[PDB]
Amino acid sequence: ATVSMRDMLKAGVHFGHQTRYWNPKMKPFIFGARNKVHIINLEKTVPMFNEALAELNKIASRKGKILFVGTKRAASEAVKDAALSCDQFFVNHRWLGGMLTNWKTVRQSIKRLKDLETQSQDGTFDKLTKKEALMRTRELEKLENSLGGIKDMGGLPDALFVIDADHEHIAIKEANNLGIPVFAIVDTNSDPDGVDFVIPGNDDAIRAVTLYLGAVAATVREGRSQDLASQAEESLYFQGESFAQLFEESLKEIETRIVRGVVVAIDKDVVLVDAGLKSESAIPAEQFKNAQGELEIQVGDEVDVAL
Amino acid sequence: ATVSMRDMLKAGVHFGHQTRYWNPKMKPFIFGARNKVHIINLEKTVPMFNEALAELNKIASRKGKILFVGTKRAASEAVKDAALSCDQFFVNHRWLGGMLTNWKTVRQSIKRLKDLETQSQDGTFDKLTKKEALMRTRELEKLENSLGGIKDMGGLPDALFVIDADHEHIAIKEANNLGIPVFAIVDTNSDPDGVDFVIPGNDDAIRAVTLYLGAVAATVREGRSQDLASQAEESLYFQGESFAQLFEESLKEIETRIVRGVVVAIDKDVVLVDAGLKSESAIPAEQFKNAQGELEIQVGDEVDVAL
Ligand SMILES: [Zn+2]
Ligand SMILES: [Zn+2]
Protein backbone atom coordinates (compact mmCIF):
# COMPACT_ATOMS: atom_id res chain seq x y z
CA ALA A 1 0.00 0.00 0.00
CA THR A 2 1.22 3.46 -0.98
CA VAL A 3 0.11 6.90 -2.07
CA SER A 4 2.17 8.53 -4.82
CA MET A 5 4.09 11.76 -4.43
CA ARG A 6 2.10 13.34 -7.28
CA ASP A 7 -1.15 12.44 -5.41
CA MET A 8 0.17 14.07 -2.24
CA LEU A 9 1.26 17.18 -4.12
CA LYS A 10 -2.23 17.55 -5.62
CA ALA A 11 -3.85 17.18 -2.20
CA GLY A 12 -1.62 19.86 -0.66
CA VAL A 13 0.20 17.47 1.71
CA HIS A 14 3.41 19.52 1.40
CA PHE A 15 1.86 22.84 2.62
CA GLY A 16 3.26 23.58 6.09
CA HIS A 17 2.41 26.45 8.43
CA GLN A 18 3.98 29.91 8.27
CA THR A 19 7.58 29.66 9.46
CA ARG A 20 6.90 31.91 12.46
CA TYR A 21 4.71 29.09 13.87
CA TRP A 22 7.12 26.19 13.41
CA ASN A 23 8.42 23.70 15.93
CA PRO A 24 12.21 23.32 15.31
CA LYS A 25 11.88 19.58 15.93
CA MET A 26 10.23 19.29 12.49
CA LYS A 27 13.40 20.50 10.73
CA PRO A 28 14.41 17.06 9.39
CA PHE A 29 11.07 16.85 7.53
CA ILE A 30 11.12 20.35 6.08
CA PHE A 31 12.23 20.95 2.50
CA GLY A 32 12.52 24.72 2.72
CA ALA A 33 10.53 27.95 2.86
CA ARG A 34 8.74 29.95 0.20
CA ASN A 35 7.03 33.25 1.02
CA LYS A 36 7.54 32.81 4.78
CA VAL A 37 5.83 29.41 4.64
CA HIS A 38 7.46 26.01 5.31
CA ILE A 39 7.37 23.34 2.58
CA ILE A 40 7.20 19.73 3.83
CA ASN A 41 9.63 17.29 2.15
CA LEU A 42 7.45 14.63 0.48
CA GLU A 43 10.68 12.71 -0.20
CA LYS A 44 10.37 11.88 3.48
CA THR A 45 6.56 11.68 3.71
CA VAL A 46 6.25 8.89 1.13
CA PRO A 47 8.56 6.28 2.71
CA MET A 48 7.44 7.24 6.24
CA PHE A 49 3.78 6.83 5.28
CA ASN A 50 4.53 3.45 3.59
CA GLU A 51 6.27 2.34 6.80
CA ALA A 52 3.24 3.41 8.81
CA LEU A 53 0.82 1.67 6.44
CA ALA A 54 2.81 -1.59 6.53
CA GLU A 55 2.66 -1.79 10.34
CA LEU A 56 -1.04 -0.87 10.48
CA ASN A 57 -1.64 -3.67 7.95
CA LYS A 58 0.19 -6.13 10.24
CA ILE A 59 -1.78 -4.95 13.30
CA ALA A 60 -5.09 -5.30 11.46
CA SER A 61 -4.12 -8.78 10.27
CA ARG A 62 -3.97 -10.10 13.84
CA LYS A 63 -7.49 -8.79 14.42
CA GLY A 64 -6.05 -5.61 15.96
CA LYS A 65 -8.40 -2.78 16.86
CA ILE A 66 -7.65 0.66 15.40
CA LEU A 67 -8.77 3.90 17.07
CA PHE A 68 -9.05 6.85 14.67
CA VAL A 69 -8.71 10.16 16.56
CA GLY A 70 -9.50 13.52 15.00
CA THR A 71 -11.68 16.20 16.52
CA LYS A 72 -10.73 19.37 14.61
CA ARG A 73 -13.16 20.64 11.96
CA ALA A 74 -11.08 19.43 8.99
CA ALA A 75 -10.78 15.86 10.34
CA SER A 76 -13.99 15.22 12.26
CA GLU A 77 -16.50 13.90 9.73
CA ALA A 78 -13.83 12.08 7.65
CA VAL A 79 -12.39 10.26 10.68
CA LYS A 80 -15.83 8.73 11.25
CA ASP A 81 -16.23 7.90 7.56
CA ALA A 82 -12.86 6.16 7.45
CA ALA A 83 -13.35 4.19 10.69
CA LEU A 84 -16.77 2.93 9.59
CA SER A 85 -15.42 1.95 6.19
CA CYS A 86 -12.99 -0.58 7.74
CA ASP A 87 -15.06 -1.62 10.78
CA GLN A 88 -12.93 0.17 13.35
CA PHE A 89 -13.43 2.87 15.96
CA PHE A 90 -13.15 6.61 16.42
CA VAL A 91 -13.21 9.66 18.61
CA ASN A 92 -14.18 12.73 16.58
CA HIS A 93 -15.90 15.30 18.80
CA ARG A 94 -13.72 15.75 21.87
CA TRP A 95 -11.38 13.75 24.04
CA LEU A 96 -12.19 13.14 27.71
CA GLY A 97 -9.09 12.77 29.89
CA GLY A 98 -8.83 9.12 30.89
CA MET A 99 -10.65 7.53 27.94
CA LEU A 100 -7.67 5.19 27.63
CA THR A 101 -5.84 5.39 30.95
CA ASN A 102 -9.03 5.01 32.99
CA TRP A 103 -10.54 2.44 30.63
CA LYS A 104 -12.23 0.36 33.38
CA THR A 105 -14.36 3.43 34.16
CA VAL A 106 -15.13 4.06 30.49
CA ARG A 107 -16.41 0.46 30.32
CA GLN A 108 -19.09 1.26 32.91
CA SER A 109 -19.93 4.54 31.17
CA ILE A 110 -20.62 2.48 28.05
CA LYS A 111 -23.27 0.37 29.80
CA ARG A 112 -24.73 3.58 31.21
CA LEU A 113 -24.96 4.87 27.62
CA LYS A 114 -26.79 1.75 26.48
CA ASP A 115 -29.26 1.95 29.40
CA LEU A 116 -30.01 5.62 28.59
CA GLU A 117 -30.40 4.55 24.91
CA THR A 118 -33.13 2.12 25.95
CA GLN A 119 -34.78 4.60 28.39
CA SER A 120 -35.15 7.31 25.73
CA GLN A 121 -36.84 4.85 23.36
CA ASP A 122 -39.14 2.85 25.64
CA GLY A 123 -40.90 5.86 27.19
CA THR A 124 -39.05 6.08 30.52
CA PHE A 125 -38.18 9.73 29.82
CA ASP A 126 -41.84 10.65 29.33
CA LYS A 127 -42.77 9.43 32.81
CA LEU A 128 -40.22 11.89 34.30
CA THR A 129 -40.63 15.61 35.00
CA LYS A 130 -39.23 17.99 32.37
CA LYS A 131 -36.37 18.97 34.71
CA GLU A 132 -35.42 15.31 35.26
CA ALA A 133 -35.85 14.15 31.66
CA LEU A 134 -33.57 16.98 30.56
CA MET A 135 -30.86 15.82 33.02
CA ARG A 136 -30.86 12.32 31.48
CA THR A 137 -31.06 13.70 27.94
CA ARG A 138 -27.98 15.88 28.48
CA GLU A 139 -26.12 12.92 30.04
CA LEU A 140 -27.03 10.81 26.98
CA GLU A 141 -25.76 13.64 24.73
CA LYS A 142 -22.38 13.77 26.53
CA LEU A 143 -21.94 9.99 26.42
CA GLU A 144 -22.93 9.62 22.76
CA ASN A 145 -20.73 12.51 21.55
CA SER A 146 -17.66 11.14 23.33
CA LEU A 147 -18.16 7.34 23.37
CA GLY A 148 -20.44 6.74 20.39
CA GLY A 149 -17.57 5.71 18.11
CA ILE A 150 -16.13 3.21 20.58
CA LYS A 151 -19.09 1.67 22.34
CA ASP A 152 -18.43 -1.71 20.68
CA MET A 153 -14.63 -1.60 20.93
CA GLY A 154 -14.64 -3.95 23.94
CA GLY A 155 -11.19 -3.15 25.28
CA LEU A 156 -8.10 -1.02 24.68
CA PRO A 157 -7.17 -0.39 21.02
CA ASP A 158 -4.02 -1.94 19.59
CA ALA A 159 -3.08 1.29 17.76
CA LEU A 160 -4.03 4.96 17.38
CA PHE A 161 -4.25 6.83 14.12
CA VAL A 162 -4.27 10.56 14.83
CA ILE A 163 -4.94 13.67 12.78
CA ASP A 164 -2.84 16.58 14.21
CA ALA A 165 -0.42 15.56 16.93
CA ASP A 166 -0.54 18.87 18.85
CA HIS A 167 -4.31 19.18 18.77
CA GLU A 168 -4.60 15.58 20.09
CA HIS A 169 -1.67 15.61 22.56
CA ILE A 170 -3.79 14.37 25.48
CA ALA A 171 -4.77 11.12 23.72
CA ILE A 172 -1.24 10.62 22.42
CA LYS A 173 0.18 10.88 25.96
CA GLU A 174 -2.33 8.33 27.29
CA ALA A 175 -1.36 5.92 24.52
CA ASN A 176 2.35 6.50 25.33
CA ASN A 177 1.72 5.56 28.96
CA LEU A 178 -0.07 2.39 27.92
CA GLY A 179 2.51 1.43 25.30
CA ILE A 180 -0.06 1.71 22.52
CA PRO A 181 1.68 2.73 19.26
CA VAL A 182 0.76 6.13 17.85
CA PHE A 183 0.53 6.80 14.08
CA ALA A 184 0.03 10.49 13.38
CA ILE A 185 0.00 13.23 10.79
CA VAL A 186 2.48 15.78 12.11
CA ASP A 187 2.40 19.31 10.64
CA THR A 188 5.31 21.79 10.78
CA ASN A 189 4.01 23.53 13.94
CA SER A 190 3.85 20.34 15.99
CA ASP A 191 5.94 18.21 18.38
CA PRO A 192 6.72 14.73 16.87
CA ASP A 193 8.28 13.29 20.08
CA GLY A 194 5.25 11.35 21.33
CA VAL A 195 4.54 9.89 17.91
CA ASP A 196 5.84 6.41 17.13
CA PHE A 197 5.17 6.53 13.41
CA VAL A 198 5.22 10.14 12.34
CA ILE A 199 3.86 11.11 8.96
CA PRO A 200 5.02 14.62 8.08
CA GLY A 201 2.15 16.40 6.36
CA ASN A 202 -0.57 19.02 6.18
CA ASP A 203 -3.27 18.36 8.76
CA ASP A 204 -5.54 21.33 7.85
CA ALA A 205 -7.00 20.45 4.43
CA ILE A 206 -10.02 18.11 4.20
CA ARG A 207 -8.65 16.81 0.92
CA ALA A 208 -5.26 16.01 2.49
CA VAL A 209 -6.93 14.38 5.50
CA THR A 210 -9.13 12.38 3.15
CA LEU A 211 -6.10 11.19 1.21
CA TYR A 212 -4.44 9.82 4.40
CA LEU A 213 -7.49 8.16 5.91
CA GLY A 214 -8.39 6.55 2.59
CA ALA A 215 -5.02 4.82 2.32
CA VAL A 216 -5.25 3.80 5.98
CA ALA A 217 -8.75 2.33 5.64
CA ALA A 218 -7.73 0.35 2.55
CA THR A 219 -4.66 -1.17 4.21
CA VAL A 220 -6.76 -2.07 7.25
CA ARG A 221 -9.36 -3.82 5.08
CA GLU A 222 -6.51 -5.69 3.32
CA GLY A 223 -5.04 -6.76 6.67
CA ARG A 224 -8.39 -8.14 7.86
CA SER A 225 -9.46 -9.96 4.69
CA GLN A 226 -6.09 -11.00 3.26
CA ASP A 227 -7.76 -10.55 -0.16
CA LEU A 228 -4.74 -9.35 -2.14
CA ALA A 229 -2.13 -11.33 -0.19
CA SER A 230 -3.72 -14.81 -0.40
CA GLN A 231 -4.27 -14.17 -4.11
CA ALA A 232 -0.66 -13.18 -4.86
CA GLU A 233 0.54 -16.55 -3.52
CA GLU A 234 -0.23 -18.24 -6.85
CA SER A 235 2.69 -16.44 -8.55
CA LEU A 236 5.33 -17.42 -5.98
CA TYR A 237 5.93 -20.87 -7.52
CA PHE A 238 5.28 -23.44 -10.27
CA GLN A 239 1.67 -24.67 -10.43
CA GLY A 240 1.66 -26.38 -13.84
CA GLU A 241 0.92 -29.96 -12.81
CA SER A 242 -1.81 -31.47 -14.95
CA PHE A 243 -5.10 -32.43 -13.31
CA ALA A 244 -4.36 -35.98 -14.44
CA GLN A 245 -1.12 -36.10 -12.46
CA LEU A 246 -2.80 -34.51 -9.41
CA PHE A 247 -5.82 -36.78 -9.54
CA GLU A 248 -3.83 -40.01 -9.89
CA GLU A 249 -1.62 -38.89 -6.99
CA SER A 250 -4.72 -38.34 -4.81
CA LEU A 251 -5.93 -41.89 -5.52
CA LYS A 252 -2.78 -43.28 -3.88
CA GLU A 253 -3.59 -41.26 -0.73
CA ILE A 254 -6.00 -44.10 0.14
CA GLU A 255 -4.64 -46.29 2.95
CA THR A 256 -5.88 -48.48 4.35
CA ARG A 257 -8.99 -50.22 5.81
CA ILE A 258 -15.44 -47.88 7.77
CA VAL A 259 -14.01 -44.33 7.50
CA ARG A 260 -12.58 -41.50 9.65
CA GLY A 261 -13.98 -37.96 9.87
CA VAL A 262 -14.84 -34.71 11.65
CA VAL A 263 -18.13 -33.38 13.06
CA VAL A 264 -19.09 -30.03 11.54
CA ALA A 265 -22.66 -29.49 12.73
CA ILE A 266 -24.94 -30.83 15.47
CA ASP A 267 -28.64 -30.02 15.17
CA LYS A 268 -30.80 -32.36 17.29
CA ASP A 269 -31.11 -35.80 15.63
CA VAL A 270 -28.76 -34.61 12.85
CA VAL A 271 -25.00 -35.00 13.31
CA LEU A 272 -22.92 -33.91 10.32
CA VAL A 273 -19.58 -35.51 9.55
CA ASP A 274 -17.05 -34.47 6.92
CA ALA A 275 -15.26 -37.65 5.85
CA GLY A 276 -14.02 -36.16 2.58
CA LEU A 277 -16.56 -37.82 0.27
CA LYS A 278 -18.76 -36.03 -2.33
CA SER A 279 -21.07 -34.86 0.45
CA GLU A 280 -20.70 -34.52 4.22
CA SER A 281 -22.48 -37.38 5.98
CA ALA A 282 -25.56 -36.72 8.08
CA ILE A 283 -25.82 -39.26 10.86
CA PRO A 284 -28.68 -39.85 13.35
CA ALA A 285 -27.69 -38.46 16.77
CA GLU A 286 -28.53 -41.81 18.42
CA GLN A 287 -25.19 -43.35 17.42
CA PHE A 288 -23.56 -40.53 19.34
CA LYS A 289 -25.47 -40.66 22.60
CA ASN A 290 -24.40 -42.22 25.90
CA ALA A 291 -26.39 -44.48 28.27
CA GLN A 292 -28.10 -41.41 29.76
CA GLY A 293 -29.11 -40.09 26.32
CA GLU A 294 -26.67 -37.16 26.24
CA LEU A 295 -24.51 -36.06 23.28
CA GLU A 296 -20.91 -37.27 23.71
CA ILE A 297 -19.36 -35.24 20.87
CA GLN A 298 -19.07 -31.57 19.93
CA VAL A 299 -18.77 -29.57 16.68
CA GLY A 300 -15.15 -29.98 15.58
CA ASP A 301 -14.72 -33.38 17.25
CA GLU A 302 -13.18 -36.32 15.41
CA VAL A 303 -15.23 -39.50 14.90
CA ASP A 304 -15.58 -42.73 12.91
CA VAL A 305 -18.15 -43.75 10.28
CA ALA A 306 -19.25 -46.83 8.32
CA LEU A 307 -18.94 -46.66 4.53
CA ALA B 1 -8.69 -13.61 -8.70
CA THR B 2 -8.30 -17.38 -8.85
CA VAL B 3 -8.54 -20.55 -6.82
CA SER B 4 -5.79 -23.12 -7.41
CA MET B 5 -6.37 -26.61 -8.72
CA ARG B 6 -4.79 -28.11 -5.59
CA ASP B 7 -7.30 -26.10 -3.46
CA MET B 8 -10.20 -27.41 -5.53
CA LEU B 9 -8.93 -30.98 -5.29
CA LYS B 10 -8.77 -30.71 -1.49
CA ALA B 11 -12.31 -29.33 -1.32
CA GLY B 12 -13.69 -32.17 -3.45
CA VAL B 13 -14.67 -29.94 -6.40
CA HIS B 14 -13.89 -32.78 -8.86
CA PHE B 15 -16.35 -35.31 -7.29
CA GLY B 16 -19.27 -35.76 -9.72
CA HIS B 17 -22.41 -37.85 -9.29
CA GLN B 18 -22.66 -41.57 -10.04
CA THR B 19 -22.55 -42.04 -13.81
CA ARG B 20 -26.07 -43.47 -13.88
CA TYR B 21 -27.33 -39.99 -12.90
CA TRP B 22 -25.41 -37.93 -15.46
CA ASN B 23 -26.66 -35.45 -18.00
CA PRO B 24 -24.80 -36.17 -21.31
CA LYS B 25 -24.52 -32.42 -21.90
CA MET B 26 -21.82 -32.34 -19.19
CA LYS B 27 -19.52 -34.61 -21.22
CA PRO B 28 -17.09 -31.84 -22.27
CA PHE B 29 -16.40 -31.11 -18.57
CA ILE B 30 -15.95 -34.71 -17.46
CA PHE B 31 -12.48 -36.20 -17.06
CA GLY B 32 -13.56 -39.82 -16.74
CA ALA B 33 -15.14 -42.35 -14.40
CA ARG B 34 -13.79 -44.27 -11.43
CA ASN B 35 -15.92 -46.82 -9.58
CA LYS B 36 -19.09 -45.86 -11.50
CA VAL B 37 -18.63 -42.21 -10.50
CA HIS B 38 -17.86 -39.28 -12.83
CA ILE B 39 -14.70 -37.21 -12.23
CA ILE B 40 -14.97 -33.52 -13.17
CA ASN B 41 -12.04 -32.12 -15.21
CA LEU B 42 -10.53 -29.33 -13.09
CA GLU B 43 -8.39 -28.46 -16.13
CA LYS B 44 -11.64 -26.93 -17.34
CA THR B 45 -13.00 -25.72 -13.97
CA VAL B 46 -10.03 -23.45 -13.24
CA PRO B 47 -10.08 -21.28 -16.40
CA MET B 48 -13.90 -21.28 -16.49
CA PHE B 49 -14.07 -20.12 -12.88
CA ASN B 50 -11.43 -17.41 -13.55
CA GLU B 51 -13.52 -16.23 -16.50
CA ALA B 52 -16.60 -16.11 -14.28
CA LEU B 53 -14.74 -14.26 -11.51
CA ALA B 54 -13.36 -11.66 -13.94
CA GLU B 55 -16.83 -10.75 -15.24
CA LEU B 56 -18.37 -10.65 -11.74
CA ASN B 57 -15.53 -8.29 -10.77
CA LYS B 58 -16.41 -6.01 -13.72
CA ILE B 59 -20.13 -6.08 -12.82
CA ALA B 60 -19.41 -5.22 -9.19
CA SER B 61 -17.12 -2.38 -10.26
CA ARG B 62 -20.00 -0.53 -11.94
CA LYS B 63 -21.98 -0.77 -8.70
CA GLY B 64 -23.75 -3.88 -10.02
CA LYS B 65 -26.04 -5.81 -7.69
CA ILE B 66 -25.35 -9.53 -7.23
CA LEU B 67 -28.05 -12.02 -6.24
CA PHE B 68 -26.71 -15.18 -4.59
CA VAL B 69 -29.17 -18.08 -4.99
CA GLY B 70 -28.86 -21.35 -3.10
CA THR B 71 -31.62 -23.07 -1.19
CA LYS B 72 -30.40 -26.66 -0.80
CA ARG B 73 -29.07 -27.72 2.62
CA ALA B 74 -25.38 -27.62 1.59
CA ALA B 75 -25.61 -24.07 0.19
CA SER B 76 -28.22 -22.30 2.30
CA GLU B 77 -26.36 -20.85 5.28
CA ALA B 78 -23.15 -20.18 3.28
CA VAL B 79 -24.99 -18.28 0.53
CA LYS B 80 -26.21 -15.84 3.20
CA ASP B 81 -22.75 -15.61 4.76
CA ALA B 82 -21.14 -14.83 1.42
CA ALA B 83 -23.74 -12.26 0.32
CA LEU B 84 -23.50 -10.39 3.63
CA SER B 85 -19.72 -10.41 3.47
CA CYS B 86 -19.72 -8.35 0.23
CA ASP B 87 -22.88 -6.29 0.82
CA GLN B 88 -25.01 -8.08 -1.75
CA PHE B 89 -28.25 -10.05 -1.77
CA PHE B 90 -29.54 -13.59 -1.52
CA VAL B 91 -32.34 -16.09 -1.72
CA ASN B 92 -31.58 -19.12 0.45
CA HIS B 93 -34.81 -20.72 1.66
CA ARG B 94 -37.05 -21.16 -1.37
CA TRP B 95 -37.77 -19.48 -4.66
CA LEU B 96 -41.22 -18.03 -5.36
CA GLY B 97 -42.14 -18.09 -9.06
CA GLY B 98 -42.03 -14.51 -10.32
CA MET B 99 -39.51 -13.06 -7.85
CA LEU B 100 -37.68 -11.66 -10.88
CA THR B 101 -40.20 -11.72 -13.74
CA ASN B 102 -42.96 -10.18 -11.63
CA TRP B 103 -40.63 -7.77 -9.85
CA LYS B 104 -43.14 -4.88 -9.68
CA THR B 105 -45.32 -7.11 -7.47
CA VAL B 106 -42.37 -8.16 -5.31
CA ARG B 107 -41.69 -4.45 -4.72
CA GLN B 108 -45.11 -4.05 -3.08
CA SER B 109 -44.63 -7.26 -1.09
CA ILE B 110 -41.46 -5.68 0.31
CA LYS B 111 -43.36 -2.69 1.72
CA ARG B 112 -45.93 -5.11 3.11
CA LEU B 113 -43.05 -6.92 4.86
CA LYS B 114 -41.80 -3.69 6.39
CA ASP B 115 -45.30 -2.73 7.62
CA LEU B 116 -45.72 -6.17 9.25
CA GLU B 117 -42.22 -5.71 10.76
CA THR B 118 -43.40 -2.51 12.45
CA GLN B 119 -46.79 -4.01 13.50
CA SER B 120 -45.18 -6.96 15.30
CA GLN B 121 -42.91 -4.62 17.26
CA ASP B 122 -45.21 -1.72 18.18
CA GLY B 123 -47.95 -3.86 19.75
CA THR B 124 -50.47 -3.94 16.89
CA PHE B 125 -50.48 -7.76 16.99
CA ASP B 126 -51.43 -7.78 20.68
CA LYS B 127 -54.60 -5.77 20.04
CA LEU B 128 -55.77 -8.49 17.60
CA THR B 129 -57.50 -11.79 18.39
CA LYS B 130 -55.26 -14.88 18.50
CA LYS B 131 -56.75 -16.13 15.20
CA GLU B 132 -56.01 -12.80 13.48
CA ALA B 133 -52.57 -12.23 14.98
CA LEU B 134 -51.57 -15.70 13.80
CA MET B 135 -52.66 -14.84 10.22
CA ARG B 136 -50.36 -11.80 10.16
CA THR B 137 -47.54 -13.69 11.89
CA ARG B 138 -47.61 -16.45 9.26
CA GLU B 139 -47.69 -13.85 6.47
CA LEU B 140 -44.65 -12.15 8.04
CA GLU B 141 -42.91 -15.56 8.21
CA LYS B 142 -43.53 -16.23 4.49
CA LEU B 143 -42.32 -12.77 3.45
CA GLU B 144 -39.20 -12.82 5.63
CA ASN B 145 -38.13 -16.34 4.58
CA SER B 146 -38.44 -15.51 0.87
CA LEU B 147 -37.66 -11.76 0.64
CA GLY B 148 -35.50 -11.15 3.71
CA GLY B 149 -32.25 -11.30 1.74
CA ILE B 150 -33.41 -8.86 -0.93
CA LYS B 151 -35.56 -6.32 0.86
CA ASP B 152 -32.97 -3.58 0.26
CA MET B 153 -32.03 -4.62 -3.28
CA GLY B 154 -34.17 -1.84 -4.79
CA GLY B 155 -34.51 -3.24 -8.29
CA LEU B 156 -33.54 -6.17 -10.51
CA PRO B 157 -30.06 -7.65 -9.91
CA ASP B 158 -27.37 -7.24 -12.54
CA ALA B 159 -26.22 -10.88 -12.16
CA LEU B 160 -27.12 -14.19 -10.50
CA PHE B 161 -24.68 -16.50 -8.77
CA VAL B 162 -26.30 -19.90 -8.36
CA ILE B 163 -25.43 -23.05 -6.43
CA ASP B 164 -26.82 -26.10 -8.36
CA ALA B 165 -28.28 -25.27 -11.75
CA ASP B 166 -30.92 -28.04 -11.75
CA HIS B 167 -32.12 -27.39 -8.22
CA GLU B 168 -32.49 -23.65 -9.08
CA HIS B 169 -33.83 -23.99 -12.65
CA ILE B 170 -36.85 -21.76 -12.00
CA ALA B 171 -34.72 -18.73 -11.05
CA ILE B 172 -32.29 -19.39 -13.88
CA LYS B 173 -35.14 -19.37 -16.42
CA GLU B 174 -36.49 -16.07 -15.07
CA ALA B 175 -33.04 -14.52 -15.39
CA ASN B 176 -32.75 -15.88 -18.96
CA ASN B 177 -36.04 -14.18 -19.88
CA LEU B 178 -34.84 -10.89 -18.43
CA GLY B 179 -31.38 -11.11 -20.00
CA ILE B 180 -29.72 -11.21 -16.58
CA PRO B 181 -26.46 -13.20 -16.80
CA VAL B 182 -26.32 -16.45 -14.84
CA PHE B 183 -23.13 -17.69 -13.13
CA ALA B 184 -23.59 -21.20 -11.76
CA ILE B 185 -21.94 -24.25 -10.30
CA VAL B 186 -23.02 -27.08 -12.59
CA ASP B 187 -22.60 -30.67 -11.35
CA THR B 188 -22.45 -33.76 -13.62
CA ASN B 189 -26.19 -34.51 -13.28
CA SER B 190 -27.29 -31.07 -14.45
CA ASP B 191 -28.27 -29.16 -17.61
CA PRO B 192 -25.76 -26.32 -18.39
CA ASP B 193 -27.82 -24.78 -21.24
CA GLY B 194 -29.43 -21.94 -19.28
CA VAL B 195 -26.15 -20.98 -17.64
CA ASP B 196 -24.14 -18.14 -19.16
CA PHE B 197 -20.99 -18.75 -17.17
CA VAL B 198 -20.91 -22.38 -16.18
CA ILE B 199 -18.51 -23.55 -13.53
CA PRO B 200 -18.23 -27.35 -13.64
CA GLY B 201 -18.03 -28.61 -10.08
CA ASN B 202 -19.39 -30.43 -7.06
CA ASP B 203 -22.44 -28.65 -5.65
CA ASP B 204 -23.08 -31.05 -2.72
CA ALA B 205 -20.19 -30.45 -0.29
CA ILE B 206 -20.34 -27.50 2.13
CA ARG B 207 -16.57 -27.20 1.85
CA ALA B 208 -16.73 -27.02 -1.96
CA VAL B 209 -19.59 -24.51 -1.83
CA THR B 210 -17.63 -22.46 0.69
CA LEU B 211 -14.59 -22.46 -1.58
CA TYR B 212 -16.63 -21.01 -4.51
CA LEU B 213 -18.55 -18.38 -2.57
CA GLY B 214 -15.39 -17.22 -0.83
CA ALA B 215 -13.63 -16.49 -4.11
CA VAL B 216 -16.79 -14.81 -5.42
CA ALA B 217 -17.20 -12.57 -2.36
CA ALA B 218 -13.56 -11.51 -2.52
CA THR B 219 -13.72 -10.55 -6.19
CA VAL B 220 -16.92 -8.61 -5.55
CA ARG B 221 -15.31 -6.68 -2.70
CA GLU B 222 -12.33 -5.94 -4.98
CA GLY B 223 -14.65 -4.70 -7.74
CA ARG B 224 -16.43 -2.32 -5.36
CA SER B 225 -13.42 -0.88 -3.55
CA GLN B 226 -10.77 -1.02 -6.29
CA ASP B 227 -8.30 -1.62 -3.44
CA LEU B 228 -5.84 -3.89 -5.25
CA ALA B 229 -6.29 -2.33 -8.70
CA SER B 230 -5.71 1.34 -7.79
CA GLN B 231 -2.66 0.22 -5.82
CA ALA B 232 -1.08 -1.78 -8.67
CA GLU B 233 -1.06 1.35 -10.86
CA GLU B 234 2.17 2.56 -9.23
CA SER B 235 4.18 -0.19 -10.96
CA LEU B 236 2.92 0.51 -14.49
CA TYR B 237 5.39 3.37 -15.08
CA PHE B 238 8.37 5.48 -13.94
CA GLN B 239 7.68 7.55 -10.81
CA GLY B 240 11.23 8.57 -9.85
CA GLU B 241 10.98 12.34 -10.19
CA SER B 242 12.46 14.10 -7.19
CA PHE B 243 10.16 16.14 -4.94
CA ALA B 244 12.34 19.13 -5.84
CA GLN B 245 11.59 18.76 -9.55
CA LEU B 246 7.87 18.23 -8.85
CA PHE B 247 7.61 21.14 -6.44
CA GLU B 248 9.39 23.63 -8.71
CA GLU B 249 7.15 22.52 -11.59
CA SER B 250 4.04 23.17 -9.45
CA LEU B 251 5.21 26.73 -8.72
CA LYS B 252 5.06 27.53 -12.45
CA GLU B 253 1.42 26.39 -12.50
CA ILE B 254 0.58 29.85 -11.12
CA GLU B 255 -0.99 32.09 -13.78
CA THR B 256 -2.10 34.73 -13.55
CA ARG B 257 -3.97 37.45 -11.56
CA ILE B 258 -8.39 37.22 -5.96
CA VAL B 259 -8.61 33.44 -6.54
CA ARG B 260 -10.85 30.76 -8.13
CA GLY B 261 -12.39 27.80 -6.29
CA VAL B 262 -15.12 25.25 -5.58
CA VAL B 263 -17.80 25.08 -2.86
CA VAL B 264 -17.57 21.87 -0.83
CA ALA B 265 -19.92 22.49 2.09
CA ILE B 266 -22.80 24.83 2.93
CA ASP B 267 -23.90 24.96 6.57
CA LYS B 268 -25.93 28.11 7.35
CA ASP B 269 -23.62 31.16 7.63
CA VAL B 270 -20.65 28.94 6.71
CA VAL B 271 -19.78 28.42 3.04
CA LEU B 272 -16.67 26.33 2.43
CA VAL B 273 -14.50 26.85 -0.63
CA ASP B 274 -11.56 24.75 -1.79
CA ALA B 275 -9.20 27.12 -3.60
CA GLY B 276 -6.22 24.80 -3.28
CA LEU B 277 -4.48 26.62 -0.40
CA LYS B 278 -3.26 25.02 2.87
CA SER B 279 -6.83 24.99 4.18
CA GLU B 280 -10.24 25.24 2.52
CA SER B 281 -11.67 28.73 3.00
CA ALA B 282 -14.74 29.27 5.16
CA ILE B 283 -16.71 32.25 3.92
CA PRO B 284 -19.73 33.98 5.52
CA ALA B 285 -22.91 33.01 3.62
CA GLU B 286 -23.82 36.71 3.18
CA GLN B 287 -21.45 37.14 0.22
CA PHE B 288 -23.42 34.38 -1.47
CA LYS B 289 -26.96 35.58 -0.94
CA ASN B 290 -29.24 37.37 -3.40
CA ALA B 291 -31.45 40.44 -2.85
CA GLN B 292 -34.14 38.23 -1.29
CA GLY B 293 -31.65 36.63 1.13
CA GLU B 294 -31.56 33.21 -0.56
CA LEU B 295 -28.47 31.08 -1.25
CA GLU B 296 -27.40 31.38 -4.91
CA ILE B 297 -24.84 28.55 -4.92
CA GLN B 298 -24.83 24.83 -4.19
CA VAL B 299 -22.28 22.27 -2.93
CA GLY B 300 -20.02 21.53 -5.90
CA ASP B 301 -20.54 24.95 -7.51
CA GLU B 302 -17.62 27.02 -8.77
CA VAL B 303 -16.99 30.48 -7.27
CA ASP B 304 -14.45 33.28 -6.80
CA VAL B 305 -12.60 34.44 -3.67
CA ALA B 306 -10.37 37.30 -2.49
CA LEU B 307 -6.86 36.39 -1.36
ZN1 LIG C 1 -1.72 22.27 10.68
ZN1 LIG D 1 -24.70 -32.42 -7.08
Author numbering:
A (entry chain A), B (entry chain A): 2 to 258, 262 to 311
What does the paper say about this structure?
In sharp contrast, protein S1, which is essential for translation initiation in Gram-negative bacteria (1), is still lacking from the high-resolution structures available for Escherichia coli and Thermus thermophilus ribosomes (2). The protein associates late during assembly of the 30S ribosomal subunit and interacts with a pyrimidine-rich region in the 5′ untranslated region (5′UTR) of mRNAs. Thus, the protein shows RNA chaperone activity and is essential for the binding and the accommodation of structured mRNAs into the decoding channel. Structurally, S1 is composed of six contiguous domains (D1–D6), which are connected via linkers providing the flexibility that is likely to play a role in recruitment of mRNA transcripts to the ribosome.
